[PDB]
Design a protein around this ligand. Structure first.
Ligand SMILES: OC[C@H]1O[C@H](O[C@H]2[C@H](O)[C@@H](O)[C@@H](O)O[C@@H]2CO)[C@H](O)[C@@H](O)[C@@H]1O
Length: 722
């Protein structure tokens, strides 16, 4: 925000210019500059940035969002003298009251209406069922019957609710968030009807707000569906239009979700009193509302005085008839999640991606899945561009006996950063490792503190190939494999961990057959009522790189991968095509690993190797035998472990034999400085004092190799071992 200046956000389809004129008058009378912006996806931007401390002093939007905003603590409480509260209709105040407090100034009442071309269609239909036949009549003379935005569920909700659909059941003043009604026969009936319209080529699933508006206003289609804001543009057009009641479906009224355009004050705003002055004494006046209304009609206003003038307009009348027949939107926080569920359901059902029953079943479950929704939020923040990415769904859900524990795996196109030389890739995000539903169907509920589910979800970044229109799906199957491992082992992962796989990740001949895990570079962790969720990105590595990771640590090797862009880069993007290890690409990298093992120690506690040396015996002489391969690890054993007071264990692949190098100062060994070499059966422990260890290392500064010291002998060999 800012002090002495007023920043306002309002959607671009509203009358921002009129509002700007009111801002001009305010700037004249008070000297405070009033800036009016209309960013895309503002409502979302607003929750997103309000916390950091950027944001609008005032935010305009339908009330349905505000309850959420208020629960997050983004909104200041508004305080009007009774003198002012009486100027507005009580029910508009109702729409903006949350948890007993007023959290926004109600501005206007928005409801969708059926807008029709009087020239093309003298008497509009009273029912949806006529439209198919009606379209056919018009198609005969190169026109269409109906076109409206199919991308926002706001416009198809009236039809869906008509025969029984609902968001949350309201009884006794309480909305039951668990009782969602988008899955019932009614909702199925309306959405099935829309889908059938598209099947019989009376509508097109691609159609959006702008195509619908252009079509109707140019006079290409007979009808459209929209709110009062739209009219101004139609007035400019050649079309003579009427605004009327929406068509009935199966004998029942269409029930549009009525909104109440409201203005909220940012809790992080310095100028809150300036905001109150502007809204109460400048905007919410006959003069202010008229100013805005000339630009784009607001609908049925909340200011009694001005509304009395407006109510005469037959268009407003129709607006209020549709409004009455429909319901007013709830303002609870769960609305946003509901809207998202339905938006996906409609689009997928209309495009043929899914059936009506499957889409609505998914929307039904997802309307009340705070975890799935809290993740979808962050996904939405990263990809405001992509509302519905290709998404792999597990059709037999895990908690019904299904094999795949990941309910969903979303697949995004990431454009990368040209400035950072980061290539375009596909970004897979998984859903199911965390608590999505929080009703104990998969994961025990644990509360807000602590990890939701296993506390993380999996992500993956697959370098996009030349001409790849769509992301491949094999990474989802991979993610299902890992997910199963976690679910059966009950074993969590942390940034740095490695996964040994030893098969091409993509079931090709690729050299990438193992995985490392790191924090997703872009995905921020999220607060889920069911817990906190972090995002672990999978990074494909060669067998050599995995080995480096075991010998040193995961973290170091990931960074090495970041420096070699071809092998990952800053965001650690997996290229299944890669043919060389990072070490074949830059040998100085091996050097970096050796320095790390020296100064960090190594995470390798033991190896299965070709090698050789109940009562706890003691020995004064010891002769070890090693394969070249296990002989290679001796420096690691000493430099990497004993010099860090860490023990190391060779176990013979055949034998029951074992050799555990023990630093002076390790705990629980049966080897003492007094008696360094001791054995319990086939298991041998030898304790080396640090000085001797250093000496030994210098001595090791190819085959056969023999070493001797006063105490003990060491042999390096090739085929004595079977
Ligand atoms: O698409 C779902 C959407 O519906 C409503 O958004 C309306 C808004 O109320 C109107 O003022 C106008 O801008 O049309 C919007 C839809 O394009 C809800 O208010 C919103 O929360 C929801 O996302």
């Amino acid at each position: 925000t800012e002090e002495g200046k007023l920043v306002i956000w309002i959607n671009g389809d509203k009358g921002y210019n009129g509002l700007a004129e009111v801002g001009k008058k305010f700037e004249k009378d008070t000297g405070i500059k009033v800036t009016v912006e209309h960013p895309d996806k503002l409502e979302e931007k607003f929750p997103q940035v309000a916390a950091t401390g950027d944001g609008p002093d005032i935010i305009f939007w339908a009330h349905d969002r505000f309850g959420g905003y208020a629960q997050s603590g983004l909104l200041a409480e508004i305080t009007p003298d009774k003198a002012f509260q009486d100027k507005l209709y009580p029910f508009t105040w109702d729409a903006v009251r949350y948890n007993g407090k007023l959290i926004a100034y109600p501005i206007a009442v928005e409801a969708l209406s059926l807008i029709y071309n009087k020239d093309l269609l003298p008497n509009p239909p009273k029912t949806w069922e006529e439209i198919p036949a009606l379209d056919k009549e018009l198609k005969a003379k190169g026109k269409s019957a109906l076109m409206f935005n199919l991308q926002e569920p706001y416009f198809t909700w009236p039809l869906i609710a008509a025969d029984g659909g609902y968001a949350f059941k309201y009884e006794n003043g309480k909305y039951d968030i668990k009782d969602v009604g988008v899955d019932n026969a009614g909702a199925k009936a309306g959405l099935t009807f829309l889908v059938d319209l598209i099947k019989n080529k009376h509508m097109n699933a691609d159609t959006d707000y702008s195509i619908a508006e252009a079509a109707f206003n140019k006079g290409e289609t007979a009808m459209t569906i929209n709110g009062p804001w739209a009219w101004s543009n139609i007035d400019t057009s050649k079309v003579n239009y009427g605004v009327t009641v929406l068509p009935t479906f199966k004998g029942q009224p269409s029930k549009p979700f009525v909104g109440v355009l409201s203005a909220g004050i940012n809790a992080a705003s310095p100028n809150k009193e300036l905001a109150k002055e502007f809204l109460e004494n400048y905007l919410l006046t006959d003069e202010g509302l008229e100013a805005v209304n000339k630009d784009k009609p607001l609908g049925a206003v909340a200011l009694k005085s001005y509304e009395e003038e407006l109510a005469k307009d037959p268009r407003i009348a129709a607006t209020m008839e549709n409004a009455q027949k429909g319901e007013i939107m709830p303002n609870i926080p769960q609305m946003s999640a509901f809207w998202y569920a339905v938006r996906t359901a409609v689009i997928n059902a209309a495009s043929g991606r899914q059936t009506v029953d499957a889409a609505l079943a998914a929307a039904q479950t997802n309307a009340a899945a705070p975890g799935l929704h809290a993740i979808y939020g962050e996904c939405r923040r990263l990809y405001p561009d992509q509302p519905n990415p290709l998404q792999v769904t597990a059709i037999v859900k895990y908690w019904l006996g299904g094999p795949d524990p990941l309910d969903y795996v979303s697949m995004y196109r990431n454009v990368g950063s040209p400035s950072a030389n980061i290539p375009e890739h596909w970004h897979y995000i998984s859903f199911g490792l965390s608590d999505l539903y929080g009703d104990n169907r998969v994961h025990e509920f644990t509360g807000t503190d602590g990890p939701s589910g296993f506390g993380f979800e999996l992500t993956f970044r697959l370098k996009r190939e030349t001409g790849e229109s769509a992301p491949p799906t094999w990474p989802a199957e991979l993610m299902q494999g890992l997910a199963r491992y976690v679910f059966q082992s009950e074993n969590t992962f942390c940034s740095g961990d490695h996964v040994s796989w030893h098969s091409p990740l993509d079931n090709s001949e690729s050299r990438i057959q193992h995985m490392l895990l790191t924090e997703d570079p872009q995905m921020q962790p999220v607060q889920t009522p069911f817990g906190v969720v972090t995002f672990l990105q999978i990074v494909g590595v060669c067998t050599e790189e995995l080995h480096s990771a075991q010998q040193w640590n995961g973290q170091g090797i990931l960074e090495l991968l970041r420096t070699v862009p071809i092998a990952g880069g800053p965001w650690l993007i997996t290229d299944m095509r890669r043919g060389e290890t990072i070490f074949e690409i830059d040998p100085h990298l091996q050097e970096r690993v050796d320095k790390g093992i020296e100064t960090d120690g190594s995470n390798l506690s033991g190896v299965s190797a070709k090698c050789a040396w109940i009562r706890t015996r003691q020995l004064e002489s010891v002769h070890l035998k090693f394969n070249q391969e296990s002989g290679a690890l001796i420096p690691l054993c000493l430099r990497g472990r004993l010099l860090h007071g860490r023990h190391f264990t060779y176990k013979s692949i055949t034998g029951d034999m074992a050799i555990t190098f023990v630093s002076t100062g390790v705990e629980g060994a049966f080897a003492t400085e007094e008696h360094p070499y001791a054995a319990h059966g086939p298991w041998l422990q030898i304790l080396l004092t640090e000085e001797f260890v250093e000496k030994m290392l210098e001595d090791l500064e190819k085959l056969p190799k023999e070493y001797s010291w006063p105490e003990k002998k060491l042999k390096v060999s090739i085929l004595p071992d079977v």
